């Protein structure tokens, strides 16, 4: 067949794309983090109303986040290069 | 099950379309020719090859 | 049928748009935080009129906010790519 000669490229593209996709469903989950050596209590922030004054500080609350550095651009650019290479052989 | 990428389908469909567009056109792709110099050794007029 | 080849993409997109919308519905609630080791009192701010002088400091009042960092652009960028990939196949 004619597709025999281009199997490794398709396999590599699939391998990279799976990880790129699955690293986006982990960054869509919300989890707060309250400092235990402080003075604010999570029971007051949950029973309030749409506009109210409660007691606490803003330094004791922060949110978990994914801090992967320059490990997104590299994979993305390699994937685009592979796709552009495959595009020239099938007359796209 | 759906593969993680959608680059193969486009390429395969595009190539399958173009190959058939080139191979089988609407106008005929045959000729059914007759040898030359054999009309010449047999004909007696200047309007025989055209009629054949 | 013809729509059965692309079920995975739709199921992937519908799991990210929901989270993006829920975040926006959560980030529109007002909660004010008053530091309890200070000198300002919510009872004077609440019963005042327009254009009136009261007593306090502006260093004891702050508001609660969602502080997820680069966890919004990644999801937006991936969801943007899936849409174009699904639109290349239905002739849009």
Inter-chain CB proximity A53 and C36 less than 8 Å: no
Closest residue on chain A to C28 (Cα)? A50
Q: By three-state DSSP, how is residue B2 classified?
A: coil
Q: What is the 3-state secondary structure (H, E, C) of chain A?
A: CCHHHHHHHHHHHHHHHHHHHHCCCCCCCCCEEECCCCCCCCCCCCCCCCCCEEECCCCCEEECCCCCCCCCHHHHHHHHHHHHHHHCCCCC
d(CA C26, CA C66): 9
| A45 contacts on C by Cβ (under 8 Å) | 31, 64
CA–CA distance from A8 to each of B1, C24, C70 (Å)?
A: 20, 42, 33
CA-nearest of A53, A65, A30, A58 to C25 is: A30
Q: State this model's resolution in angstroms.
A: 3.1
Closest residue on chain C to B13 (Cα)? C89
Tokens of B4: 């993680």
Helix pair angle (A7-22, A73-87), 10° resolution: 150
Count CB-CB contacts under 10 A for residue A17.
19
Contacting partners of chain A (3+ CB pairs under 8 A): B, C
**Phi/psi-derived region of residue C40, left when phi > 0, alpha when psi is between -120 and 50, beta in every other case:** beta
Method: cryo-EM
Closest residue on chain B to A80 (Cα)? B7
C33 and chain A in contact, CB less than 8 A: yes
Tokens of A74: 């590299």
Q: For chain C, give percent helix, strand, coil, nearest 5.
A: 50, 5, 45
CA torsion sign for B40, B43, B47, B48 is negative
Inter-chain CB proximity B14 and A21 less than 8 Å: no
Return phi, psi of residue A73, to 5°.
-65, -40
The angle at the Cα of A14, spanning B20 to A74, to the nearest 5 degrees, equals: 120
Inter-chain CB proximity A92 and B4 less than 8 Å: no
Tokens of A92: 């796209």
d(CA A16, CA A9): 11
């Amino acid at each position: 067949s004619y597709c025999e000669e281009y199997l490794g490229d398709l396999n590599s593209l699939e391998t990279i794309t799976e990880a790129i996709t699955k690293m986006a469903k982990v960054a869509s989950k919300v989890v707060g983090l309250v400092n235990p050596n402080g003075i604010t209590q999570p029971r007051r922030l949950n029973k309030a109303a749409t506009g109210e004054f409660v007691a606490g500080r803003v330094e004791d609350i922060n949110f978990l986040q994914l801090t992967k550095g320059q490990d997104f651009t590299i994979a993305k650019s390699v994937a685009d290069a592979i796709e552009q290479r495959l595009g020239w052989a099938f007359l796209l | 099950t759906t593969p993680w990428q959608a680059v193969g389908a486009r390429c395969l469909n595009n190539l399958a379309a173009k190959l058939m567009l080139a191979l089988f056109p609407q106008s005929p792709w045959m000729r059914l020719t007759v040898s030359e110099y054999e009309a010449k050794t047999l004909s007696q007029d200047s309007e025989a090859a055209a009629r054949v």
